[PDB]
């Protein structure tokens, strides 16, 4: 579940795991396909699409989806989630505004995007009716068994985590998640790369002049614009899109 910089995250620009990129109000059926940077779906391991894994800390939190809310000018209706990606039936709206409820906090994310829903037809409704003729609209699927396209999803770059840079009672003290690769030095001269377990820092003292980094590329990410490049390489991780636009007859 990637974490990026939401633009108007309740107050202002936070870093939400559900940071909204690639809003697509381009279909007709009241539907938008969205990408959160969060990867809900199965858990970390193997079970139940209808659970909920975002990033809290450096860490995931693969738990229940209980109180998702996509919304716009009005509250939307979820359609389905798969991967980083959710489909939801929305009305028109100047913006798009997404958010779940972890339980202790609202913890939402919101974004600008021009949305409309013309139905296909010479009638310019604002909303799909219960009746009328069927005719060839453009629309996204409910399903996941989907390969019609795939987007590049290679590694994450590093990320900041100054929870690492503690103090060794006079020196600034870095640690490691699980033996992950922490890329480290300070403005002063000390250890210059950092590919280590928990190091200390001989030279500098201040937490605010050091490289708290997490090269933790055991799991790839979506290639968000709000991602810092993993400078090393274009790793593999070509990964499908579920919600292909299909020729449904709305």
């Amino acid at each position: 579940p990637y974490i990026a910089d939401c633009p108007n995250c309740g107050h202002s620009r936070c870093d939400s795991p559900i940071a909204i990129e690639e809003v697509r109000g381009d279909a007709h059926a009241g539907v938008i396909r969205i990408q959160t940077s969060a990867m809900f779906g199965l858990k970390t391991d193997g079970v139940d699409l209808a659970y909920m894994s975002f990033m809290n800390g450096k860490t995931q939190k693969s738990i229940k989806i209980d109180n998702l809310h996509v919304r716009t000018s009005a509250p939307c209706s979820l359609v389905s989630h798969h991967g980083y990606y959710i489909l939801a039936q929305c009305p028109p709206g100047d913006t798009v505004t997404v958010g779940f409820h972890d339980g202790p906090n609202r913890h939402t994310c919101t974004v600008a995007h021009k949305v409309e829903f013309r139905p296909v037809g010479r009638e310019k409704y604002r909303h799909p009716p219960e009746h009328g003729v069927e005719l060839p609209c453009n629309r996204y699927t409910h399903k996941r068994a989907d390969q019609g396209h795939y987007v590049e999803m290679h590694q994450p770059g590093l990320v900041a985590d100054h929870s690492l840079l503690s103090i060794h009672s006079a020196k600034v003290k870095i640690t490691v998640p699980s033996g992950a690769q922490v890329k480290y030095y300070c403005k002063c001269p000390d250890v210059r790369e950092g590919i280590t377990s928990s190091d200390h820092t001989t030279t500098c003292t201040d937490v605010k002049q050091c490289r708290a980094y997490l090269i933790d590329n055991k799991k790839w990410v979506y290639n968000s614009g709000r991602l810092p490049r993993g400078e090393g390489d274009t790793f593999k991780g070509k990964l499908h899109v579920p919600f292909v636009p299909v020729k449904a007859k709305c």
Epitope: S169, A170, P189, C204
Partner: antibody
Framework: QIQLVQSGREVKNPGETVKISCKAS????????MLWVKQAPGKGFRWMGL????????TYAEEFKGRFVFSLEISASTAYLQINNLTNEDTATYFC??????????WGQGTTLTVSS | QAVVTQESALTTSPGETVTLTCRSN?????????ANWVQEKPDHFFTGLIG???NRRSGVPARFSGSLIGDKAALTITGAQTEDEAIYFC?????????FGGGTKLTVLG
């Protein structure tokens, strides 16, 4: 197991230079850098700096940046302290030390310098 | 630019429990100061006891343990012995350099 054995004690008149060796035994030199500590006659213990026995970069304590120069005969597991333009108030004992376990675990025997005409 | 302070001298008897402390002039001592305890026996004989607050060097009797008590680093000798009579120095890390305390002269009956 680990022995850091130091050179013997010198006498030097003011102005001279001294190279104090520290020959390491028992560990792999390269994974543990060296602390140089000055225990001055009265004053107690003071950190002079640390040398990365892997890259070779020294850190000096600010009190020691200048006349003091750390170096190493890597090849022979030796670290060395060189004090140039000896000042009379440098008489004291200098210890090499291994930095490990979030501190220092082994200290050497000491090399005592008596700066005196 | 930090001053480590230690008790000057402490006297105990064989079999007792004695605590030496290490205080930092800048603030409470914390685990990021990686308190080290070093012992000096006569003849300029140095050995490391504890490092990173509570890691006992290998081959240092178990009667020796380190910890943080209040806002300072402490060394406890549980069952002090006659052999423990020496000077104990604490060292604290401060992001880029080490500062040594003045040392505590400990005297043990025996």
């Amino acid at each position: 197991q680990i022995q850091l054995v130091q050179s013997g004690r010198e006498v030097k008149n003011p102005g001279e230079t001294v190279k104090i060796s520290c020959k390491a035994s028992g560990y792999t030199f390269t994974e543990y850098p060296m602390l140089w500590v000055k225990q001055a006659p009265g004053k107690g213990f003071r950190w002079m700096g640390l040398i990365y026995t892997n890259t070779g970069e020294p850190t000096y304590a600010e009190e020691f940046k200048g006349r003091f120069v750390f170096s190493l005969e890597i090849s022979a597991s030796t670290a060395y302290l060189q004090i140039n333009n000896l000042t009379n108030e440098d008489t004291a004992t200098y210890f090499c030390v291994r930095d490990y376990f979030i501190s220092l675990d082994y200290w050497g025997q000491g090399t005592t310098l008596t700066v005196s005409s | 630019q930090a001053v480590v302070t230690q008790e000057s001298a402490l006297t105990t008897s064989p079999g007792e429990t004695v605590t030496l402390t290490c205080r930092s002039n800048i603030g409470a001592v914390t685990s990021s100061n990686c308190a080290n305890w070093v012992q000096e026996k006569p003849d300029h004989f140095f050995t490391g006891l504890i490092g990173d607050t509570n890691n006992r060097r290998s081959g240092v009797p178990a009667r020796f343990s380190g910890s943080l008590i209040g806002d300072k680093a402490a060394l406890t000798i549980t069952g002090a012995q006659t052999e423990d009579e020496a000077i104990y120095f604490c060292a604290l890390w401060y992001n880029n350099l080490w500062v040594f305390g003045g040392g505590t002269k400990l005297t043990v009956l025996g």
